From a paper:
Human topoisomerase II beta ([name]) modulates DNA topology using energy from ATP hydrolysis. The N-terminal half of the [name] domain contains the ATP-binding site and is directly involved in clamp closure, undergoing dimerization upon ATP binding. The C-terminal half of the [name] domain forms the transducer domain, which connects the [name] domain to the enzyme core (Oestergaard et al., 2004). A heart-shaped dimer is formed with a central cavity that is 31 Å high and 23 Å wide, the dimensions of which cannot easily accommodate a DNA duplex. Each [name] [name] protomer folds into two discrete structural modules: the N-terminal GHKL domain and the C-terminal transducer domain (colored yellow and orange respectively in Figure 2A).
The structure was solved to 2.6 Å by molecular replacement using the [name]:[name] structure as a search model. The final ADP-bound model contains residues 47–422 with missing loops between residues 169 and 173 and 356 and 366, where the K loop resides. The ADP structure is composed of a virtually unchanged GHKL domain compared with the [name] structure, with the nucleotide and most of the active-site residues in the same conformation. The adenine ring, ribose sugar, and α phosphate of ADP make the same set of residue contacts as in the [name] complex, despite the sugar pucker differing. As the γ phosphate is lost during ATP hydrolysis, R178 and N179, which were previously bound to the γ phosphate of [name], instead bind to the β phosphate of ADP. The γ phosphate-binding site is now occupied by a sulfate ion present in the crystallization condition (0.2 M ammonium sulfate), as is observed in TOP2A (Wei et al., 2005; Stanger et al., 2014). Thus, our ADP structure represents the post-hydrolysis state with the sulfate group mimicking the ATP hydrolysis product, Pi. The transducer domain of the ADP monomer opens up toward the C terminus of the protein (represented by dashed box in 4A), signifying the relaxed conformation. Moreover, during the reorganization of the transducer domain, the QTK loop is shifted away from the ATP-binding site (represented by dashed box in Figures 4B), preventing Q392 and K394 from making contacts with the nucleotide. Specifically, the side chain of Q392 moves by 3.8 Å and K394 moves by 2.5 Å.
Author numbering:
A (entry chain A), B (entry chain A): 47 to 168, 174 to 355, 367 to 422
Write the structure that this text describes.
């Protein structure tokens, strides 16, 4: 009665945040971040993993639209801590503003407003069709505007109090250029925070750079300002800038775009195996089977001393594209799909291995 | 239309197994297992993490009933690979066989047959109210019998084809002793297996010992046979049996039951920091904040050489009880709750630290 209960999905996510967005409790560790005044750096940061995940969900959704429509050119990220607002703007193709014939609602409502809703069910980050709704549910306020020329209409609706309230949809006729814009005020009470502080903002800032880094052919703007990153190699520069090798010489980097789904720089490590890596624009900070795949080859080749001893002098950077990825966790820092399932190959030329001989 | 879709919860779990039970793909690593002929040993094992999780769900549910009713004395685990059947029997209090007034179904149906159903919503392993249903959904066949004297009835129902079919409930009047018995034939096609092989059976076998180890005041029988484990210390013996120290002498173990929720043995390690540990009878093989809590103290004390250097000569075994645990993953190998949230303290006497001086 009171003992034996059944929860709604909504009620349940609220009852079991952990289970959906990750820990809603503080976690302190060394992380790569973009601080305002220093830029890219590795330091002890303290933040709530579940806060990072509602943001990264929305930012990855923009990234995915580029794989959906390659005519997409730009993403604007804006973070206003004092007002507690975050907004993510992309162009290319919007979301059809049309009544969905089966579910009898406008498609943007359906996919931002109801659970288990995705265009990716039947090489995005998106797959499970929670994500947007999770952000919505962990926001005091959550606004969707989208406009799709092909369907001749623009859409705008606002949800409130963790997706429990909602304005009706504002629907107008539209012939402009497509955009989707997601604006949310996360619910800081659920993460036990006053404000978005230096630590979460520097992490969030790092994801916009990551996206410049990860997402081919898309300008990224942070707070109205273009990010000077064009190419994976220039993103990697952010990290290797004023790194020293053993002889007080700055690090050589080796680049090879192996094909459109594998993009790889390599260099020396002087504090053991490290890795920066992305699958479908998602920062796999713990790593994955995609990292293992690649490293294998390299260790494999280099040797021509056990493998593991060489892993300790490598710093690998991978931007890759994988069909239907899986992960250890809800914050996805490690990616668990098998190589025989990735849907593409990484084959690195001799040139790369030979260039690679010639740093430490 | 075809593009923008909404899945049922059922459809979705089937569509996204990974997301619920973990990888449904082979994973190979060194693991602790009970092989038939050697007993407890650490070796490269290959198995499907999602197979282990439907089993461990049911076996943990029995363990939890002991915290629900301490008059529970016994759990029978039976694994029949040739027939593809597994059955888990416990006594103590059954499940009320009564129509649930709100949901208008017998309670056992509701809690084994519908999702987001739990008696733990408002110090079990159970919390999220998926688990049983997940097992049901990854079984070609799944049978529940329960009997609760207080409600004057016994219950029996069978589900089939991943919880898509079901006999009506067999309901009879009952005045005997309470039992709950869960019998399932996992769906091997979803894990891409022919049979349950040596590797999954030795893992499953190890969990029954773990339960003898973890679960105070409950006999455990594997395949009709009592397990000679009474006490945490005797379980620990399984691992330290014919271990050597540095001078070819078998390992000393130090025991302290700090209180009813912390139970701790310690010894030497000669292949670096290791840990065997349980929260609410769940094998946290990766570890957790509960492991960190304890180790802290010990390192802390011992020193009276950096902390980390001592971690490399410890082998810690923890059986603990935690209020409302969280985990990195769906297979729960690491547990993520903060110490200030555990709901109890571990304070170890001087005797323990002083005894602990006197091995390596
Ligand atoms: N920025 C965006 N541009 C276009 N469509 C989007 C965008 N964000 C979300 N969507 C659509 O709404 C759906 C729901 O997003 P989400 O909840 O993340 O599901 P998924 O895990 O499939 O990404 C997506 O599958 C996608 O079709
Ligand atoms: N062996 C058992 N004995 C008694 N009740 C059980 C048993 N197994 C499951 N139940 C009940 O059915 C519910 C559903 O089990 P499960 O799906 O694991 O939910 P939970 O995560 O709460 O354990 C449990 O909350 C518990 O109340
Ligand atoms: Mg998404
Ligand atoms: Mg359970």
């Amino acid at each position: 009665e009171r003992v034996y209960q059944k929860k709604t999905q909504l009620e349940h996510i609220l009852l079991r945040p952990d289970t959906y967005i990750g820990s809603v409790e503080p976690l302190t560790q060394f992380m790569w971040v973009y601080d305002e005044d220093v830029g890219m750096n590795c330091r002890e940061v303290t933040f709530v993993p579940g806060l990072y995940k509602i943001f990264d969900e929305i930012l990855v959704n923009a990234a995915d639209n580029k794989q959906r429509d390659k005519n997409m050119t730009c993403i604007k990220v804006s973070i206003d801590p004092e007002s507690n607002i975050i907004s993510i703007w992309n162009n290319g193709k919007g979301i059809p503003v049309v009544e969905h014939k089966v579910e009898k609602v406008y498609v943007p409502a359906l996919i931002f407003g109801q659970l288990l809703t995705s265009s990716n069910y039947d090489v995005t980050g998106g797959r499970n069709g929670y994500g947007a709704k999770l952000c919505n549910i962990f926001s005091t306020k959550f606004t969707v505007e989208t406009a799709c020329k092909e369907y001749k209409h623009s859409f705008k609706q606002t949800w409130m109090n963790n997706m429990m309230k909602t304005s009706e949809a504002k629907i107008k006729h539209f012939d402009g250029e497509d955009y989707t814009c997601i604006t949310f005020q996360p619910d800081l009470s659920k993460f036990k925070m006053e404000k978005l502080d230096k630590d979460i903002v520097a992490l969030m800032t790092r994801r916009a750079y990551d996206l410049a880094g990860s997402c081919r052919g898309v300008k990224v703007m942070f707070n109205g300002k273009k990010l000077p990153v064009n190419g994976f190699r220039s993103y990697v520069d952010l990290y290797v800038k004023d790194k020293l090798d053993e002889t007080g010489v700055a690090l050589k980097v080796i680049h090879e775009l192996a094909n459109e789904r594998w993009d790889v720089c390599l260099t020396l490590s002087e504090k053991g195996f490290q890795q920066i890596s992305f699958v479908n624009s998602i920062a796999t900070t713990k790593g994955g089977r995609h990292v293992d795949y690649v490293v294998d080859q390299v260790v494999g080749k280099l040797i021509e001393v056990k493998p593991f001893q060489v892993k300790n002098h490598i710093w690998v950077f991978i931007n890759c594209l994988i069909e239907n990825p899986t992960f250890d966790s809800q914050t996805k820092e490690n990616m668990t799909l098998q190589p025989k399932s990735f849907g593409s190959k990484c084959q690195l030329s001799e040139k790369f291995f030979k260039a690679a001989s010639n740093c430490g």
